[PDB]
Design a protein around this nucleic acid. Sequence first.
DNA 1: TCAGGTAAGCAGTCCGCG
DNA 2: GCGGACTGCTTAC
Length: 903
Amino acid sequence: MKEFYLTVEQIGDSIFERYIDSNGRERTREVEYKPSLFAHCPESQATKYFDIYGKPCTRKLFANMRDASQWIKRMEDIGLEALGMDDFKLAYLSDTYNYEIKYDHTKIRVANFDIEVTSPDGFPEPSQAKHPIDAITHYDSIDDRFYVFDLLNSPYGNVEEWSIEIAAKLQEQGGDEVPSEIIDKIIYMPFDNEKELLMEYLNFWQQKTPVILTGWNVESFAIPYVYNRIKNIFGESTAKRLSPHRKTRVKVIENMYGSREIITLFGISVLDYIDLYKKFSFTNQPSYSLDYISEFELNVGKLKYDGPISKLRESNHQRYISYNIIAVYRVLQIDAKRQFINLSLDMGYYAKIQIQSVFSPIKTWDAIIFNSLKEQNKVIPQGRSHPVQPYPGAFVKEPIPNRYKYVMSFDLTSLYPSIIRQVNISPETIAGTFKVAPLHDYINAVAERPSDVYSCSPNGMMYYKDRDGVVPTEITKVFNQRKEHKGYMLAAQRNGEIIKEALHNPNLSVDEPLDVDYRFDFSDEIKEKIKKLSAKSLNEMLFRAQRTEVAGMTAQINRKLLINSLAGALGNVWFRYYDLRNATAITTFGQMALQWIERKVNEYLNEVCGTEGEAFVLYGDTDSIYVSADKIIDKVGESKFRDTNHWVDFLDKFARERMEPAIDRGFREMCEYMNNKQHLMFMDREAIAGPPLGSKGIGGFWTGKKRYALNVWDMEGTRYAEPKLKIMGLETQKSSTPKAVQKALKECIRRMLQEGEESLQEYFKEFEKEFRQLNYISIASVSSANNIAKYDVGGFPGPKCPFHIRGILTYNRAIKGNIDAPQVVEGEKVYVLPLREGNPFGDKCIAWPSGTEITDLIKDDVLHWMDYTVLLEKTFIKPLEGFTSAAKLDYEKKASLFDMFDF
DNA sequence: TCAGGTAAGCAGTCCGCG
DNA sequence: GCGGACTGCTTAC
Ligand SMILES: Nc1ncnc2c1ncn2[C@H]1C[C@H](O)[C@@H](COP(=O)(O)OP(=O)(O)OP(=O)(O)O)O1
Ligand SMILES: [Ca+2]
Ligand SMILES: [Ca+2]
Ligand SMILES: [Ca+2]
Ligand SMILES: [Ca+2]
Ligand SMILES: [Ca+2]
């Protein structure tokens, strides 16, 4: 097999590389890497190497990396460009793997672990590590085994051995319900003392050295705790045995609360699962506890125990150990669904970077482009300092707040990347400039044609159309991958709706789920076989389909993120190819395109509907338009349709057969105007929206920019079994909105759109009466807690202190002394509740860490003093007032003269 | 060794307001 | 008690 790296590191004048050799063996090597950089030279003659602008460069081969760094400094002091790849390990990887890396994941050691540390005096701070590690579960992906290290003897208690027979039993039978499919995979190892545990753990780590280290919050807890604990007992160089190159970096950041540590383990690639989750999940969660995310992702119940965790080991060591193991397995289960580690490996190896750099699209794209240009023997430019400058982005149309009955939307595919490809925007393809003119003049096709020679953006820039650029070339490759995965995603989605329709008529039989590839639309014969299946097998098939759809989602949305990040990176001062000319060429062209097609769509629909000056496009954001279809429906009559599906088929046909060609004509004209290299503005129908036929629902409404709701029947070719709410921007979509309020506002919205005003009043009435009965956690608001120190005096509110920060400070006073109370972590989310005037807490609100119950010592007072009236008014009524007044609806009955008609 | 982007809504603080 | 000028946070793209 072809070799591939595992990790790369630069230590001195040495590169340290772990790799997989041609026999599939893991090896490590130290290489005295001799790097090259470049300098502009005469011309004039005979070089071979050219910078991206075509200017000749001479190659400087250095005896070591130190010398090449020093030479870089001298060139700066002289005032001359030092060209070439200055991150030498990227250069090393590029030289050593000069071919497309095909990797074998079964040879890459991916380690999942977590530790337990009993602490009788508050959170065990890793930077201190003054309490014993009493449990480690470490899952190795090569062995497919959970290695459990369990401390029996501790200054905080002596316990008996953990029992695997008890662990396996149902919780209802006194066991721990450790999943059956991992019971045979546990290798349990008890210890009579912590030193022997830690020694054995380090020895184990030498034999089975992680390449990818992950887990839940391992970067901020597990890793620094283990490092500092070992350092405190054995000395630092023993703790350095966690690095295979025996090299670590300890970054501090201190006070005032206050002091944490991130340990860098050279020769390892840490990918904390919380960081993967945050970057790649496209959720915003009110909490990032593992219980919370596990529930969300897997529908598993929280790991229940009695008493504080500080006492769990001594009261129920059996459960303590089992939960340590289960928490490790849960991260694996989430990864099985989400596939972020796969994504990371795919991305790292494609780009030729350290795997942990997949977090940085700038590092990722510097490597991709570097590698692309090196193949053509071109020399990359030096990175320069730039001052940060604000610049213009997208256009958002101001909508008339109203109800909108029948709505069709249309969207440009992968817009910013498509603009880069269409215009040919790249650092080395800049042709020149032209005299601009106001954007409005281009939108209305009245401005002078920018050029008849070069490809243009309305920001003033001209690009060559016969050369091709590194950015369009490399962005097209990732884009093409994205659309493939999006196709798998959508097919799995459509196939999912086929199973759901079939679930209306399950057969009374005993059978098996079909063996099919959910990435491809079902064939007629698979569809027939499905009509004969039992519910149990259909439900199994739906779950597999949905998993296929999630997998596709991860693959496609994150490739989308990578290419969109290339367009933004052009506007970041640390990007080697930073250039506001290019960044604004994308955003300004985008602004023109949306408004251009608004005009063209208004022009087309006025023609076909025999009218003039009527506004069909009711709204647009960045690359999308929303078209009122009321008049289209009216021209035929609601009379008249057989059912809901009938008018949806009609709008679908009208969008596909009439509107899309008119749109395509509009954009081809715009491509001609801008004299672009390639037409790539592909605007396809997205959603079909409206009420159920013969109901009183309003179909949709807008309240303002980025705030609307639609009752959607078809979405990108997926015809739903049951209509789905597309809600954007509203409080239902925000993580700061209390759980039960999200749920209540959604049902309020559902009733408005599908059922009508009357139904809405019914529900509101009930929710208002029942509000005070809801659990306090479900009605708490959530907020991130940044910049706490700034506003602390303390421990009282400073000037302009935000509400949520005020509540934290109130919490911090209420939990002085007694240490069973968990502390608020800077940058993390908190629950927030208003308090009634005169409360014993001495302020208008309180806040505590989200995902958790408020400590039992103050919980009773919070519950007694919670201001329900203010809660309901702030979180539910005020938002609902916004929705209903926009939609010309009332959530409770108004006037009226009729009032006096029951006696 | 640290670094995709901008547009834009709403909650809240401070202040003005016989 | 509720507006405008700010900060903070959060979402849509
Ligand atoms: N996370 C982001 N980072 C940077 N730019 C973004 C991001 N999301 C959206 N944009 C910008 C670039 C996009 O091309 C443009 C339109 O957004 P959007 O419609 O969500 O995706 P898209 O048009 O790129 O892909 P799709 O094919 O899924 O429609 O807005
Ligand atoms: Ca734990
Ligand atoms: Ca789009
Ligand atoms: Ca689309
Ligand atoms: Ca059937
Ligand atoms: Ca869009």
